[PDB]
Amino acid sequence: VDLGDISGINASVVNIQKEIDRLNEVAKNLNESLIDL
Amino acid sequence: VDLGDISGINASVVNIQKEIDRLNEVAKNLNESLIDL
Amino acid sequence: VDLGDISGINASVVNIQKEIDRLNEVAKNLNESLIDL
Amino acid sequence: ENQKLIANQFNSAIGKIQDSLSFTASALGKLQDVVNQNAQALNTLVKQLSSNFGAISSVLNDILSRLDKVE
Amino acid sequence: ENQKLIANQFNSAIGKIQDSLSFTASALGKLQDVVNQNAQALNTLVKQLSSNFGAISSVLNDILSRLDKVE
Amino acid sequence: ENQKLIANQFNSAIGKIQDSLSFTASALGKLQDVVNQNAQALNTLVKQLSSNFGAISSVLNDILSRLDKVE
């Protein structure tokens, strides 16, 4: 008896930490674009 | 014979409904920021 | 012996390619909203 | 004249940003729905697998008992 | 002078918002790719598990038949 | 006067867009955390299932050996 192998079934991980950090950086930098007449 | 236990393997659920609701609220509120000279 | 059936356990797929394409289209179209006095 | 241009460009940009926010909200909603469905699927699979492995364990224990009783 | 300031600040803000939209699109694309890969992985696991449980069921049924034929 | 209106509307819009960007970043962070946790869960399940199927294979092979030795 030889059961099927399932060791190859892998689940990738996402790494969008660069994008989240850049979004927060832009949300902070948009204060430098406010208009002060 | 004692097979391994797998009951602890749980899958979390995401709850970003607050953020989606806030995004739609902002997309609706940006009409109050339009310029009418 | 009749083991339980698990064939119905299915995993949906997401199709947000329309939204990503529209976001990139808007990021490109915002150049047409720049102010050139 | 330049004020009309600034106002028109700003209104156009705000409309495009509103569209972008709506599309981001839609994409996040779809991703949430699919991630939650896959989580429910994994949990259902884990529960069914626990039941199936309990059943296999019981059957195998009975088989071992019978093999002991025979030999 | 104030018009030049308004135009410059608006162009800067629109550039930053363009960057933010590009990064949001990239993040949503990565999340889509990973969610779809994990969905394909769960479906492949379910299919292989169905095959394996069918095999175990057949073998266990044969074993029960042999145990009946012996005792 | 119109310049003050343009500046005020622009500052309001930039504040709302900052809020939207913060909420998008928070949503993407939550989605990342949950997708990564579910990926770790699927990998843990695959590893445990491999171990369990190896165990079942060994036990079933021993059972087949005993059935051969008996009959």
Residues C32, C34, C37: CA angle, nearest 5 degrees: 120
Q: How were these coordinates obtained?
A: cryo-EM
Within 8 A of D46 by CB-CB distance, chain F residues are 45
Question: From CA B5, how far away is CA D53, in angstroms rounded?
Answer: 9
Instruction: Tell me how far the alpha carbon of residue A25 is from its chain's centroid.
Output: 14
**Contacts of residue E22, Cβ cutoff 8 Å, sequence gap at least 6:** C23, C24, C27
Nearest in space to E3 (alpha carbons), one of A34, B33, D3? D3
Within 8 A of F38 by CB-CB distance, chain B residues are 11-12
Chain E: residue whose CA lies nearest to C33: E14
Packing angle, helices A17-29 and F2-70, rounded to 10: 170
Contact E36, A11 (CB under 8 A): no
Resolution of this entry, Å:
2.3
In three state form, how does the secondary structure of F17-31 look? Answer: HHHHHHHHHHHHHHH
Q: Which of F17, F19, F52 sits opposite B3 (nearest CB)?
A: F52
Residues F38, E19, F9: CA angle, nearest 5 degrees: 115
Q: Which amino acid is at F11?
A: N
Question: From CA D40, how far away is CA B12, in angstroms rounded?
Answer: 9
Question: From CA A14, how far away is CA A24, in angstroms rounded?
Answer: 18
DSSP state of A5: P
Interface residue A24 vs chain E (CB under 8 A): no
Q: Which of A6, A26, A35 sits opposite E20 (nearest CB)?
A: A26
